[PDB]
Design a binder for this molecule. Structure first.
Ligand code: MG
Ligand code: ZN
Ligand code: ZN
Ligand code: ZN
Lengths: 1101, 901
DNA sequence: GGGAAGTAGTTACGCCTGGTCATTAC
RNA sequence: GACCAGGCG
């Protein structure tokens, strides 16, 4: 037989062979191999206005990753070099152009059209296939999984958008009317079109088309595509007698009123109202051609197929009305497809190439018109080569990848990579985001779904408004690529399916769909689906094909596109799983791998469609004859960070969510090459440790090699108030011995920029004469070349690099001091100094500062069970209680926090950790398979202690034992990066905004806090008017304004003769002074900017 | 000398005012020359102001930081229509004669409507209703009653296009466009005698001024320029829009002067009108918004005044302040409730100005000598003239000698100063209170624990702000009106809000329970720790073996109560009510019972205090907890705030000491039920699940009478849910029964300190049914929630029921159901707050101005009486006795007890 | 006239971190 | 200075 401990061996090979970032690398490889060629072949060629010239496109190739120096040479590039020098890791692109003269092709030529960024560790990157020591020699961490870009020295990652199905038909119903709306999205060359057909109280079918405001009737739009005879419409749509009667009711609006061209006249009248009569026909024909179901083609010949598809949509609409089909569910995962890098990059490349071809056309036309035909035909190769500007492609791709604003209005496609530690980066590389708007409630979209089982982690999600709309992939999830569709269609046509054109559907015949479109009918689909799936199991066809059927409507669905999310399962036949013990043995030895298991037919992938027909058993001892599949490992449905929590089934869901989210913030050894690596911020834990109680998944995924957190001796006891309300108490001697000690990094950058002309910057110790020269104390440890010596102490406002800018035009002959200095509220020691050259010849220096941080009051500590707090008091060792066996607690936690949160897993982990430490072996706590509690309690009883986990302690001050036994154990704890040293802030006086003369904003620039409106309301509610006057006016902008009393305008004061007079009216005696806030003066000025005139009436006192 | 603004009046600027107030005319569409100086005649001309240092404004002298700026004007080539007054122009045009300027009304109607407008003019809605009738009745008339003349209808198309419908023939009509040069001439002829009928004002609002002829230019200071470090200039959007307008105007003027076909000027005119319309407002209906070079739509005058970042809600209502600080908070129970701990780093940065007098010259002179780097010191000194001088290491020994009467010194914070403490969001009025400063070495704010509830704060990463008043009036207002001890009673419901929390109740129960006894050293140590002034221990209560004296907990607790207090009630620990009845009878029969008789019949469910001696009962949340406290409520209403503060401090510290040394903990064995309890729970769950399949099969075979509300299925669902809820309650009953009071979790839950019984029954028994929006789980596959169940299943466990406890673990299906149920709390807490805050904003913006006059009436600012007596008896809810105007029985009882003794 | 139907206006408060801009053809 | 993305209560 097979026990759950055996399936773990098989499950390990999946991660050992495939990895964790497959959905990026596979998609990018598919894009590289085929996407570029398809995009190039879409355009065809260039048609300039030259009388006898035309260019045809050939092949496209991608070169090696290289960089070109400004002086001309081109040399190889490596990722660390690109990161340090703030360059872009890209490779050149080559294209073949075939000149055509007078209709005869010439010999081809090859030109470079630009550069393309390269995904790290892809099939074309320089790091592909290298060994561990090769990566070590190159400065890379072998644990790095890859799958991100390097843009201008920064690391960018592309998240996956959760779009809707690309060609399916979805029906629904709204309550504001009786409309039975069926809407589809049609995709062709990146263009999205929305088409809807529906009925209403009139009973007449109506159609909505983009760029057509009026909902033209159904028969009118059908007759525009031909088949005017009334028999043709009914034959096209359906054959049910009730449907026949409904259609006879529908026809009378257009059956004997219009013909094929008359409907064209109506459409032309609507699309072009009041325009030229001939204009209307062409406009209507254009709209019909390339705005109605574009995915069926834009040629005028495809109108019959378009009419058939529209008739099918209308048939679905009317079938909803009679209650022959339940309404579709939008949140069901069979209706949603993911967007990966290979398609977003395809769209971006498409738009960039579309710009480039037009630019080339313009350049060629202008050059030929100016120079003349003799120059163009003298050397055609040179004429083609020198007319290409390869920057419009590179710059447009790079800017879009850098900013993150995709063409088409989408935002947030590209994000900065989170490099706090291992778990943060690994979880960030597996994100899934929704395109909905954040502010709206979206009650239906944020809820969990039954189809999410095995495809989406149910516990890892943000906490704010982003809850529900951002999710993470599960561990068993597998994304799919796309296979060619023509081969699949011609294979499907060869086993009994008749074409749709030859035979009309009828209620006794099954329907067959391929990727959402109808292709034919068959007399028996129950045998067809079995044959197709058996062929897939045998190995005749690819495994990306999934087949499902619904007998209520007599339909069969076949899917072969990319973007689906699938999970693996074990095939069960005749109540016996197909996996045997010898298979597990062969996998363990190494003779058999996961791919071979897939090929042999033991394990198959199921998407959301096939799972409708399945009946999955959970445990190997629960299978019977009815079951069709066996679950591999239930513990793997959780995401990556959510799998760290030991005994996750003993806690409340919000606490598990808090722990999973908080596991991405703890300090620890992130990557091995942190010393060389240049980052804006960084952290390091001095003595990381492996958790004593852990899940077996973390060992497999490599978490044990980059841990984060330490084990504490925790006693659950109520101390003297200082640990109340989620506060913790820490021992002092433990801190003095290295517990929870960490270091903080920060990098500064300076550049010797070049200006317009001979003006330039310079690295130099500033002279006392130059403007803005700081005190000579600050330039204390700068070497004469202008750079600071390493390993020298620095305080706030100290200068790291001395730079003198050219003089600012009004000050002549006076250089400006623009040195780079440490932040005003930081402190540390210089660690390393790097000198290098940028991509255009300018010098560049980078300096890092190292600071040591010891725990103090306010620092945030948190376990992995969702319990968080801050240090309340630090206690000397001799004051802490001690157990009668010789143990002194390392941490104290209030017992009031346990019952409300109901985190029993923390107590379980404490008992297990103490038992593991006593026994000298780690304890397994992997979800539903870990060691049971009673076994741990019995083992603890055997080892000599008490089964309840309690002990006897003595008071550390009085010196006598307490009246109650105290729970005590060992618990894993983590230190978050929200330290108090980065939050303290105070302001008395400082810089102000230029426009409003109010204090600036932000801790970084000595800003001030904001006194919001509810604070004003609170002050009003107390009744302190003078406090309001002081806070809102005295400590903010305040000014004196001269006001003309006779006319109400603001007077003018002249410094040249100390005379004050009103400009609009000649008044010089009634001028008075008023005290008001500057912001109100700006408001008065802005009101006077418009034609509104505010008049002021003064009063005494 | 100093005046104040009394009133503000609004109107429309005439071209004469614009041309008179302007200081320069702008003609050149450029800002800066190659050197960097402003171009003469450009949009950055020096006459309109100076920003860059080193330049002087020749209009008023001044410098780069003391010149307020001056206006400019542009002479438009041809008039254009102001977009803000677009609809009003249409309403005026379609309600007046086309060629005489008179209104479409007769004299009798004019008099009748003037007599109506005369009254009810101060109101808004009535005055707007009156105007609509005039427009509606004058729109229909097609012939002027004053002069015989035909009229034509007018069509208005957004945003600034007017159409006139004229008849070419009887059956043929063509539409004519009205260019602004005709609309202005038409509007210029309306007499001012009938303007009030249209709703305007002849003195300062004239119809012909709505069509612009000259456009003002805001000064330089209203659109600053920022110089980038790269050398390129950054300019505001208004500058770009004005440059475009000037260029278009210049081209149109040149084309007009040089002569051109009508189709050229009639297109440049439209372009200029579009540019002006976008300049005034960039979100006008039916017009493509102007787009910047980066693709972002531009910000303009209309956008600066609206939104959450506009000039009204962004700067005027709230603005950033100067003297403030921000940091994390940590608990500190050793300070009194009206104090706050301040880091020495912050205390040396914020300063409090002080004026030197004859009673503080010595301390100030001592402080100045310490300089700005030792803790007690100062940073600045102000001479009587007004000069500000910085204290330095080379100036302190001589500046401390020049100090004399009249000077000002900006010293550091000391113990005794008063500051404002705030936590955001500020939900009610108790979110801001004043505290006394107390300096601490470390770098976190220290807060007493009994002050947490009003702030709603918790020590898990929270932060708070601190503000320091600067003027003596502000300090006095904060000291008198904003003290912490003045806000013990909540104004919402007239009950205590500041009180014990968490351990302050558990320690009290441990101290005052039955059988508690203490030795001499513990009693002396706790009394010294609490701060009680005692110099002699009372008589011992009982003797242990070897003759060790012992004191009871009630005797120790009685030392904090005032001497003449007397009260009795029943707390939450009442289990058997047949034993409190005897005590109530004994109290009723004789108003002052013999203490021995009461001590013989003591019970934890009945609290009784007689002349400051606690005779029976135990401490609970009803003693001094929030919104339930009785002793605190009596103390604050009969002895004063100071006595309440002293009692609060002493009781909190005593309870903390009691809980610290006796020991208090919880473990995993606190949810260990015996075998028979588990068997009973299993049988209950079994029968509950069994009696649902019968209902399911009954519904499957008809045989079920539906409830009249909805169809049969909903009735089946309701019955199933009721059965499951009753099952969960019944299962929880036995778990409650089999856990005694000795368990620490039961102690911590039944006294209201933390948690509730539902947590206990969820931890030690089945979780129960999960639901979303009040209905069972139904999302998922067609006919089933999960793939592991047969389609079309309505069983108990197949749609959400969980038969496991948190201790016994959950199967994967139950785990998924629990996560599905738990997502709802997070989404609800994310969603509700937005509409809650919007409603609070509306309510606070509607009811802000209502005061209470000296007559007791509540009046609106205009003077309208809202209430003739606040509430209906003039009683402040904060000072009421739990809503009641006065508690009669308490007064009667206390007076009778005082006299009959 | 009283039924569409099409505008028009809103959607909690702070704080922190980092990254990008701010034209181009001749 | 304005935008974008991610976090904290
Ligand atoms: Mg909190
Ligand atoms: Zn005046
Ligand atoms: Zn000036
Ligand atoms: Zn007239």
């Amino acid at each position: 037989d097979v026990t759950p401990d055996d399936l773990w061996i098989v499950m390990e090979s999946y991660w050992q062979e495939k990895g964790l970032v497959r959905q990026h690398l596979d998609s990018y490889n598919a894009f590289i191999e085929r996407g570029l060629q398809e995009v190039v072949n879409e355009f065809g060629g260039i048609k300039p206005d030259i009388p006898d010239f035309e260019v045809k496109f050939g092949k496209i190739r991608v070169g090696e990753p290289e960089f070109q120096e400004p002086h001309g040479q081109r040399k190889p590039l490596y990722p660390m070099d690109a990161r340090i020098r703030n360059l872009t890791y890209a490779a050149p692109l080559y294209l073949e152009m075939i000149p055509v003269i007078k209709g005869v092709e010439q010999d081809p030529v090859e030109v470079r059209i630009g550069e393309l960024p390269i995904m790290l560790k892809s099939k074309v990157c320089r790091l592909y296939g290298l060994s561990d020591e090769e990566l070590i020699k190159l400065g890379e961490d072998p644990k790095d999984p890859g799958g991100y870009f390097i843009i201008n020295g920064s690391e960018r990652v592309i998240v996956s958008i959760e779009d809707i199905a690309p060609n399916r038909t979805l029906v629904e119903k709204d309550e504001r009317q009786e409309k039975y709306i069926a809407k589809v999205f049609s995709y062709r060359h990146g263009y999205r079109a929305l088409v809807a057909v529906e009925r209403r109280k009139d009973g007449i079918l109506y159609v909505d088309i983009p760029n057509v405001p009026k909902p033209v009737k159904f028969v009118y739009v059908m007759r525009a595509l031909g088949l005017e005879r009334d028999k043709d419409i009914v034959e096209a749509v359906g054959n049910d007698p009730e449907v026949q009667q409904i259609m006879f009711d529908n026809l009378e609006d257009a059956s004997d009123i219009t013909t094929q061209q008359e409907a064209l006249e109506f459409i032309g009248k609507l699309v072009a109202p009041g325009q030229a009569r001939e204009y209307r026909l062409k406009r209507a024909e254009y709209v019909i051609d390339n705005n109605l179901l574009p995915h069926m083609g834009v040629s005028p010949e495809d109108r019959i197929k378009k009419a058939y598809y529209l008739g099918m949509m209308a048939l679905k609409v009317i079938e909803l009305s009679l209650g022959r089909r339940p309404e579709d569910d939008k949140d069901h995962y069979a209706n949603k497809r993911l967007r990966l890098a290979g398609d977003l990059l395809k769209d971006l490349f498409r738009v960039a190439f579309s710009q480039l071809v037009k630019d080339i056309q313009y350049q060629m036309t202008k050059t030929y018109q100016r120079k003349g035909d003799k120059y163009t035909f003298g050397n055609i190769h040179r004429f083609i080569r020198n007319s290409i500007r390869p920057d419009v492609l590179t710059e447009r791709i790079e800017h879009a990848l850098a900013t993150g604003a995709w063409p088409g209005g989408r935002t947030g496609v590209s994000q900065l990579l989170d490099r706090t530690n291992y778990m943060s980066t690994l979880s960030h590389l597996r994100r899934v985001t929704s395109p909905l708007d954040r502010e709206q409630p979206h009650f239906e979209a944020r809820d969990l779904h039954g189809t999410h089982w095995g495809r989406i982690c149910p516990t890892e999600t943000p906490e704010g408004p982003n809850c529900g709309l951002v999710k993470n992939l599960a561990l068993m999830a597998q994304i799919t690529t796309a296979v060619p569709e023509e081969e699949i269609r011609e294979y499907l046509m060869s086993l009994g399916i008749v074409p749709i054109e030859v035979r009309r559907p009828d209620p006794t015949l099954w329907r067959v769909y391929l990727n959402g479109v109808l292709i034919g009918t068959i007399e028996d689909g129950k045998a067809l689906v079995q044959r197709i799936r058996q062929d897939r199991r045998s190995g005749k066809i690819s495994d990306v094909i999934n087949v499902a059927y619904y007998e209520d409507v007599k339909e069969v669905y076949v899917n072969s596109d990319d973007g689906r999310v699938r999970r693996p399962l074990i095939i069960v036949e005749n109540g016996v799983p197909k996996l045997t013990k010898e298979h597990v043995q062969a996998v363990k030895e190494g003779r058999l791998k996961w791919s071979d298991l897939i090929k042999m037919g033991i394990i198959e992938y199921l998407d959301a469609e096939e799972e409708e027909n399945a009946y999955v058993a959970m445990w190997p001892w629960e299978v019977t004859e009815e079951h069709t599949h066996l679950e591999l490992m239930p513990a793997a449905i959780l995401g990556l960070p959510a799998s760290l929590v030991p005994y996750p089934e003993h806690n409340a869901a919000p606490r598990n969510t808090y722990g999973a989210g908080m596991a991405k913030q703890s300090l620890g050894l992130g990557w091995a090459n942190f010393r060389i690596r240049v980052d804006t911020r960084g952290h390091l834990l001095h003595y990381p440790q492996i958790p004593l109680v852990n899940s077996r998944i973390m060992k497999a995924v490599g978490y044990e090699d980059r841990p984060a957190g330490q084990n504490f001796v925790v006693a659950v006891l109520a101390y003297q108030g200082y640990n109340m309300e989620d506060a913790i108490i820490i021992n002092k001697a433990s801190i003095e011995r290295g517990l929870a000690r960490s270091t903080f990094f920060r990098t500064y950058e300076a550049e010797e920029k070049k200006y317009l002309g001979g003006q330039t910057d310079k690295f130099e110790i500033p002279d006392p004469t130059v403007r803005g020269y700081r005190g000579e104390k600050y330039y204390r440890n700068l070497d004469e070349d202008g750079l600071i010596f390493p390993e020298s102490k620095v305080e706030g406002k100290d200068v790291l690099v001395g730079r003198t800018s050219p003089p600012r035009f009004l000050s002549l002959q006076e250089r400006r001091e623009t040195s780079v200095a440490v932040r005003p509220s930081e402190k540390g020691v210089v660690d390393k100094v790097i000198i290098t050259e940028t991509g255009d010849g300018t010098k560049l220096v980078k300096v890092t500062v190292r600071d040591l941080r010891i725990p103090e009051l306010g620092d945030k500590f948190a376990s992995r069970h969702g319990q968080k707090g801050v240090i309340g008091l630090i206690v000397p060792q001799e004051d802490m209680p001690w157990t009668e066996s010789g143990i002194v607690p390392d941490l104290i936690v209030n017992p009031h926090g346990i019952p409300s949160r109901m985190t029993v897993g923390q107590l379980i982990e404490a008992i297990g950790g103490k038992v593991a430490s006593l026994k000298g072996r780690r304890v397994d706590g992997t979800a539903f398979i870990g060691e049971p509690e009673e076994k741990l309690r019995k083992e603890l009883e055997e080892l000599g202690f008490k089964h309840t986990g309690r002990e006897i302690m003595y008071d550390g001050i009085t010196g006598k034992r307490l009246e109650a036994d105290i729970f005590i154990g060992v618990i894993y704890y983590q230190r978050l990066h929200h330290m108090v040293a980065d939050k303290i802030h105070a302001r008395s006086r400082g810089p102000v905004q230029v426009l409003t003369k109010q204090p600036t904003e932000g801790r970084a620039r000595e800003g001030g806090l904001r006194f919001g409106e509810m604070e004003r309301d609170v002050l009003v509610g107390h009744g302190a008017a003078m406090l309001l006057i002081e806070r809102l006016l005295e400590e903010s902008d305040k000014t004196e304004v001269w006001v003309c009393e006779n006319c109400g305008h603001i007077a003018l004061e002249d410094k040249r003769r100390r005379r004050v007079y009103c400009p609009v009216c000649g008044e010089e005696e009634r001028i008075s002074k008023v005290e008001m806030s500057y912001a109100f003066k700006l408001l008065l000025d802005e009101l006077k900017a418009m034609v509104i005139r505010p008049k002021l009436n003064l009063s005494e006192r | 000398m100093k005046k104040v603004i009394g009133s503000i009046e609004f109107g429309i600027l005439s071209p004469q005012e614009i041309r008179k107030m302007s200081a320069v005319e702008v003609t050149v569409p450029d800002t800066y020359d190659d050197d960097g100086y402003p171009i003469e005649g450009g949009v950055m001309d020096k006459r309109m102001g100076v920003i860059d240092p080193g330049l002087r404004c020749e209009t008023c002298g001044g410098r780069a930081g003391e010149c307020p700026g001056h206006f400019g004007h542009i002479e438009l080539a041809r008039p254009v229509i102001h977009v803000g007054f677009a609809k009003t122009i249409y309403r005026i045009l379609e309600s007046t004669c086309r060629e005489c300027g008179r209104i479409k009304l007769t004299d009798e109607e004019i008099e009748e409507y003037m007599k109506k407008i005369e009254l009810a003019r101060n109101r808004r809605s009535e005055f707007n209703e009156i105007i609509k009738e005039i427009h509606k009745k004058a729109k229909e008339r097609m012939v002027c009653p004053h002069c015989g003349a035909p009229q034509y209808p007018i069509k208005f198309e957004k945003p600034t296009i007017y159409w006139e419908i004229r008849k070419d023939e009887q059956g043929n009509e063509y539409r004519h466009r009205l260019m602004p040069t005709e609309v202005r001439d038409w509007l210029e002829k309306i007499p001012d005698k009938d303007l009030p009928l249209l709703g305007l004002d002849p003195e300062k609002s004239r119809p012909e001024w709505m069509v612009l002829t000259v456009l003002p230019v805001p000064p330089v200071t209203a659109r600053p320029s920022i110089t980038l470090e790269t050398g390129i200039r950054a300019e505001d959007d208004l500058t770009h829009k004005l440059v475009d307008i000037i260029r278009i105007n210049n081209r149109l003027k040149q084309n007009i002067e040089a002569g051109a076909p009508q189709l050229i000027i009639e297109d440049l005119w439209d372009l200029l009108q579009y540019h002006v319309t976008t300049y005034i407002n960039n979100e006008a209906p039916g017009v493509p918004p102007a787009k910047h070079k980066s693709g972002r739509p531009l910000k303009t005058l209309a956008q600066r005044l609206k939104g959450k970042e506009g000039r009204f809600r962004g700067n005027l209502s709230g603005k950033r302040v100067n003297f403030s600080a921000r940091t994390v908070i940590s608990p500190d129970p050793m300070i009194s409730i009206n104090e706050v701990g301040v880091p020495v780093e912050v205390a040396m940065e914020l300063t409090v100005p002080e004026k030197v007098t004859e009673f503080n010259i010595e301390r100030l002179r001592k402080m100045v000598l310490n300089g700005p780097d030792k803790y007690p010191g100062a940073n600045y000194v102000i001479d009587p003239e007004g000069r500000r001088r910085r204290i330095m290491d080379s100036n302190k020994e001589t500046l401390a000698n020049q100090l004399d009467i009249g000077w000002t010194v900006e010293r550091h914070l000391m113990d005794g100063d008063i500051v404002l403490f705030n936590r955001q969001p500020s939900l009610h009025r108790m979110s801001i209170m004043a505290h006394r400063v107390r300096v601490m070495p470390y770098r976190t704010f220290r807060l007493n624990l009994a002050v947490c509830p009003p702030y709603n704060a918790d020590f898990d990463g929270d932060e708070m702000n601190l503000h320091v008043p600067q003027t003596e009036e502000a300090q006095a207002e904060a000291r008198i009106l904003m003290e912490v001890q003045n806000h013990i009673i909540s104004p919402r419901y007239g009950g205590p809000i500041i009180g014990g929390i968490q351990d302050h109740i558990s320690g009290g129960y441990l101290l005052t329970r039955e059988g508690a006894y203490f030795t001499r050293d513990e009693v002396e140590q706790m009394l010294m720790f609490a701060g009680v002034d005692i110099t002699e221990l009372p008589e011992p209560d009982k003797y242990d073996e070897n003759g060790n004296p012992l004191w009871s907990g009630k005797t120790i607790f009685s030392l904090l109560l005032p001497e003449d207090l007397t009260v009795w009630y029943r707390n939450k620990l009442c289990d058997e009510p047949e034993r409190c009845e005897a005590l109530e009878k004994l109290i009723e029969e004789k108003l002052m019972p013999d203490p021995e008789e009461v001590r013989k019949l003591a019970y934890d469910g009945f609290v009784y205090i007689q002349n400051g001696k606690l005779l029976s009962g135990a401490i609970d949340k009803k003693a001094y907890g929030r919104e339930d406290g009785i002793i605190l409520d009596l103390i604050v209403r009969e002895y004063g705030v100071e006595r309440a503060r002293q009692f609060l401090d002493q009781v909190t510290k005593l309870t903390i000491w009691v809980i610290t040394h006796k020991g208090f903990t919880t473990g995993i064995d606190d949810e260990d039920l015996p075998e028979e309890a588990r068997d009973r729970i299993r049988e209950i769950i079994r029968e509950a699940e069994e009696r649902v399949n019968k209902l399911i099969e009954a519904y499957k075979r008809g045989e079920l009478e539906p409830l009249p509300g909805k169809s049969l299925e909903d009735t089946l669902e309701s019955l199933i849910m009721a059965v499951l809820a009753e099952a969960r309650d019944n299962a929880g009953a036995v778990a409650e029964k089999y856990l005694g009071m000795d368990n620490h979790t039961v102690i911590m839950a039944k006294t209201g300190a933390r948690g509730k019984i539902l947590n206990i029954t969820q931890m030690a028994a089945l979780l129960g049914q999960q639901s979303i929006r009040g209905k069972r789980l139904y999302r998922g596959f067609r006919g089933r929630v999960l793939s592991h169940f047969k389609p079309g299943d309505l069983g108990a466990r197949a749609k959400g029921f969980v038969v496991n406890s948190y201790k016994s673990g959950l199967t994967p299906q139950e785990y998924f159901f629990h996560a599905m149920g738990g997502r709802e709390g997070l989404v609800d807490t994310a969603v509700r707050t937005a509409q809650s805050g919007y409603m609070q904003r509306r309510l606070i913006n509607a009811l802000q101005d209502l005061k209470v006059e000296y007559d007791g009436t509540v009046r609106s600012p205009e003077g309208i009486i809202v209430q003739f007596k606040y509430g209906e008896d003039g009683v402040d809810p904060m000072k009421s006795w739990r809503g009641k105007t006065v508690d009669v029985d308490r007064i009667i009882v206390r007076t009778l007890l005082k006299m009959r003794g």
